[PDB]
Amino acid sequence: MVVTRIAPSPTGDPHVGTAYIALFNYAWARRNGGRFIVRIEDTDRARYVPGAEERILAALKWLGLSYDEGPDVGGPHGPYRQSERLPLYQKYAEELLKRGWAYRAFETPEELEQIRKEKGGYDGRARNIPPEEAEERARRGEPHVIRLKVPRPGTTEVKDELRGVVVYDNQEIPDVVLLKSDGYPTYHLANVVDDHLMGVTDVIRAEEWLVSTPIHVLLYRAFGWEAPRFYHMPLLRNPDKTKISKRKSHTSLDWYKAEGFLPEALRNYLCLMGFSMPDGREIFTLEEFIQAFTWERVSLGGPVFDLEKLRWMNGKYIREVLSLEEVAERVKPFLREAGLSWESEAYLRRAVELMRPRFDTLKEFPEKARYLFTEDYPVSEKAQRKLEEGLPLLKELYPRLRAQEEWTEAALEALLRGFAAEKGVKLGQVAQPLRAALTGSLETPGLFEILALLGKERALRRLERALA
């Protein structure tokens, strides 16, 4: 049975790269009727962030993914936090020492710096310390690390399921640290011990870890374990071909959520990063992704993660995938956040209908249609100047509107049409000043649809305010 996993580090915001990797791990598992598990890599007691674990778990669920074993749900092969299995790594490191596959190294930071500059990296000199002498020094409390004893000379063959076999000269593989002087493990030791004990059969991770694989293959060999299948996903790239980074762009899944991006849209977009549908469709469900999933369709080139394309997909979901009622429900949290209310559901539905063609994110709705829910809306500098320019025209029009019995889009349109002809001006000369007065903006949906929405009295009231 296929068993995949994700091993996120709770060191900050939930990263989009984590969602991307999680998505493919989840799909490969579900397509094979297997299991997808979550294991928290929280050994870095320096970068640990309280609440980061919960936020990453929440983000995965928000996206529509689910997992079968993890910190909160539990599982048969836990603990599911590496910080809760520190004793296991120490015991496995000791097993490697016993097998001659590891050794204790006592160099100080200053010594390592000198060796590094002299040899180009650590040269494994501690391998020549008599084993019993190394144990005695350790027993006496001398600080040290446990390193992998790479076979010198030798070669290590590694297979990535998407790229093929690579033959590494062991000279390219250093005697990496497996257990740190503080008793904590490095990812090299932790991932191998945990993937094995959790029954992971398919390791799917970012390509930046590809060159680290021979170290892991050496570890599986050292323990006498069977190595799992390895799949390295191409890194997400910026339009300029550079690797996306949290230090250069928005990578926080919480930011996307707060900005009004729909989880179904973002999930759909990540699906297009390292994969394409046969017929080429770009809009599809998570289930369709799983049903169509195959490694044969996963591109190796660097996938471009473009915010403009994401926004486009978000908007397409907003006006072509969801129903008007679903959209109305989802903008509610954003209206409340903006401190706005709605008289009724029928009114909200109408406002959403009028604005639907004008916003790509849920957060833009309250921002662009604030004047529809309150009188406390901003008046642009451009709209104010336009209002001032047409004030005399509006002043003369006011009486007509007040005496206007038929208050409908068509009637109002006809009224302004006649008025413009009467004043010898084009409809637009009257329409724009009026839009500014009623909305504080020069860009809104149909002027006449907006002028009839609130109602004569409510419309006149706001107009008098603008004319005052």
Ligand SMILES: Nc1ncnc2c1ncn2[C@@H]1O[C@H](COP(=O)(O)OP(=O)(O)OP(=O)(O)O)[C@@H](O)[C@H]1O
């Ligand atoms: N461009 C990317 N494509 C895919 N996965 C990525 C990408 N960048 C980071 N990741 C993954 O996201 C997770 C978080 O990595 P990390 O915290 O280093 O973010 P980062 O953007 O790489 O920041 P930094 O630039 O400092 O390295 C890791 O699992 C990492 O492999």
Ligand SMILES: [Mg+2]
């Ligand atoms: Mg990084």
